């Protein structure tokens, strides 16, 4: 076998669990169609977000 | 290289290889394996024949890491199942790449 | 989410098994039963990491003469104008880097 | 017979902690949240 | 599989987006595959050498994938017939002994 | 649709009596109408989750009445 | 005159409720079955008064 | 109110009564019976919620 | 009336085989005449004690091997 | 029925310049879908909860850019 | 603005934790469990 | 004949679903064939050893596959 060193665990003492995730938003609309993200990995920041 | 753990995949169906993160934590994978309940062994035997008759059962559970898919800035409903499908998953997980290499 | 195996064996077999072969006809199924699971189990973590996996040598990590996908040694644009073995073998090294940089 | 049953593989379902069986759920646990990371 | 049978893949078999058929190749063993795009399989392939090729061709465009599943609790919890349940049968296995001779 | 999911119900065609049966159902049930009422115990069947209905007989979320008479139905006896 | 009752419980829910609740869906069960047989004799004998 | 009206009249009676036993004995398949099944209970657990 | 009670049996109609079936049949026997003789065990049936005879088919006491025959016929498998 | 609800919105009538206007608007939106698009903000609004919707123009669950759509036109300029 | 909103007084919604504004919530926890007393 | 004797093979009819039947069939296989391939496990049958095909349908060791495929068949349905 490969055992599991090729993925992670998040072991279960009961049934069922949950995971949240935070997102930075931005245009008064944090949740909404167009909604960008602030932080997103792939895109760079809105540079004249808070500029001209 | 002294880089990366290569792993073999001895039931590989025609030639290929996948390049994945890990991160050190166990919240950190792409993937996870999550288990619950394993090898509870059962054992009895049918009276009506008396054969005896034994087996084991186990529970585990799967998932996506948020934000795996990596290509919205938004989740739709934003209470959603973290179990891999066709609308989820398939070739979009972040963390994993995968090529066929052909002419060995 | 779950799964289970059954190994139902006869009293009439085990009394032989043991009596001939020196067999426990018990044991042996046990070890066999959880076997199967745990080999099953691990199998399906790598089925379902190809199945999240992305399609890899695609988007930036492509040359624009490639096939999208798959490295084919063959092909001298994958292999760069590569020769024999010692050269063309680099190229595959090259195009897995490209995809462990595209990962982060 | 007394079913455990299960939730129905739908995030509305897991996290109302709703089953198909005789027992409601508390609720699906908590495994944390995730964070962003700050570009460089 | 334990829980359901899927249907196997074969010359010309039209595959629906999201379902899984299996195949065992005559090489690398059991595959089951949730097809990913309408796809026909294309009966000009008929003995197995060249179904087994097309398959994989299939596999390498995407438009098929490796997959492996879990049973749901509200199936494996009631397999074999509890509580009025039926034709749910747990899978089982165990094993054999043979033999070879010579002569002098 | 329920917009979450449902519970699919497959029942196999039982003998009753002589010139009886109970015919077999496949339905649909939305996953909270399931959960708030059911009587499937004895009925012969399989169930299963699904995204959407298994099956072209479906029972919504507000539907309730029609799907408490339809699981009755279950064992409703014909030919 | 004979009087009876069954349960019938399953391994899983015995599992989750116990991992959830801290019940063990056997116990519940037991005292209940035991219960109504005991509660339904109690009439018995009134409801024979009453009729009687 | 017309059931209690007969039950005033003694028209009606209020009756329990165990099983006979050769019918108790067979119950679920016993000896080749059939249709014969155990009574049988079991529990739920429900739940409320309320908001600020 | 046999003044003994009854005896109440139902045997629940079964396939056989092909074409073959042993047909549901509603009886009921002098209770003295059951505990006398009879055959059913095994018959995918029901049994029931009775003041009076439950069923339009009765076997009175006197009967003894009209009423063998007709237990033993439980069994017979037709069309 | 969203059975979850519905957020119900009103967008009170605002003039803009000569003969230019943002027109009012009486809307319910499933709870669901609420919660997943809203782009009002700053707009001269006013919202609350109901267990049904409130306005005879509703954006069901199952409607998704029918209510994206109708969020943009909540800002639309008029005559 | 970062508003808070609310549930639909839904039931559902609440056990979920789903609401109308930025944040959704983890969960209503517990109160403790009701059983009744058995007749005398 | 395989002189080795012969595994009898007889199955049942059944009512696997509206209007389908798996019949009952009836099968001598040469003992050393019963021997190397026997799917014969949940086929609702009965068996014995003879010296002699019990059956009209024997598979003699030297058929193989015609035995293969009559054993799959054993499970067969048809209208």
Request: aromatic share 10%; glycine share 10%.
């Amino acid at each position: 076998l490969i055992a599991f060193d090729i993925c992670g665990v998040q072991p279960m003492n009961s049934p069922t669990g949950q995971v949240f995730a935070l997102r930075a938003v931005y245009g008064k609309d944090p949740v909404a169609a167009g909604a960008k993200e602030a932080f997103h990995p792939m895109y760079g920041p809105d540079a004249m977000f808070s500029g001209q | 290289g002294g880089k990366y753990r290569v792993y073999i995949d001895q039931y590989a169906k025609q030639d290929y290889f996948t390049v994945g993160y890990k991160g050190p934590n166990e919240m950190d994978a792409g993937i996870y394996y999550a288990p619950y309940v394993a090898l509870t062994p059962l054992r009895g035997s049918d009276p009506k024949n008396f054969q005896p008759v034994m087996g084991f059962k186990t529970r585990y559970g799967i998932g996506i890491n948020p934000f795996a898919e990596s290509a919205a800035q938004a989740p739709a409903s934003r209470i959603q199942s973290g179990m891999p499908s066709i609308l989820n998953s398939l070739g979009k997980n972040a963390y994993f790449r995968r090529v066929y290499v052909k002419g060995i | 989410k779950s799964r289970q195996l059954k190994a139902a064996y006869s009293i009439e077999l085990a009394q032989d098994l043991r009596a001939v072969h020196g067999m426990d006809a018990d044991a042996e199924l046990s070890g066999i039963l959880a076997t199967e699971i745990m080999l099953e189990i691990n199998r399906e973590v790598v089925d379902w990491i190809n199945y999240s996996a992305q399609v890899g040598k695609s988007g930036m990590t492509l040359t624009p003469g490639s096939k999208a996908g798959v490295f084919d040694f063959q092909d001298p644009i994958d292999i760069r104008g590569a020769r024999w073995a010692g050269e063309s073998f680099k190229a595959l090294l090259f195009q897995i880097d490209k995809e462990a940089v595209e990962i982060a | 017979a007394e079913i455990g049953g299960d939730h129905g593989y739908n995030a509305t379902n897991i996290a109302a902690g709703q089953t198909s069986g005789a027992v409601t759920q508390i609720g699906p646990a908590v495994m944390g949240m995730v964070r962003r990371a700050i570009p460089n | 599989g334990a829980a359901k049978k899927f249907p196997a893949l074969a010359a010309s078999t039209q595959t629906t987006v999201g379902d899984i058929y299996t195949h065992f190749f005559q090489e690398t063993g059991t595959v089951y595959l949730q097809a990913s795009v309408q796809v026909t399989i294309d009966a000009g392939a008929t003995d197995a050498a060249k179904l087994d090729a097309e398959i994989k061709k299939q596999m390498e465009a995407g438009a098929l994938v490796e997959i492996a599943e879990g049973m749901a609790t509200s199936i494996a919890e009631l397999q074999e017939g509890f509580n009025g349940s039926t034709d749910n049968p747990w899978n089982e296995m165990g094993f054999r002994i043979d033999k070879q001779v010579i002569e002098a | 649709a329920s917009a979450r999911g449902y519970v699919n119900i497959k029942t196999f065609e039982q003998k009753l009596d002589g010139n009886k049966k109970i015919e077999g159902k496949e339905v649909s049930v939305a996953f909270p109408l399931y959960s708030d009422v059911h009587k499937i115990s004895g009925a012969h069947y399989q169930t299963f989750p699904s995204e959407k209905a298994a099956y072209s007989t479906v029972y919504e979320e507000n539907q309730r009445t029609e799907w408490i008479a339809a699981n009755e139905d279950l064992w409703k006896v014909t030919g």
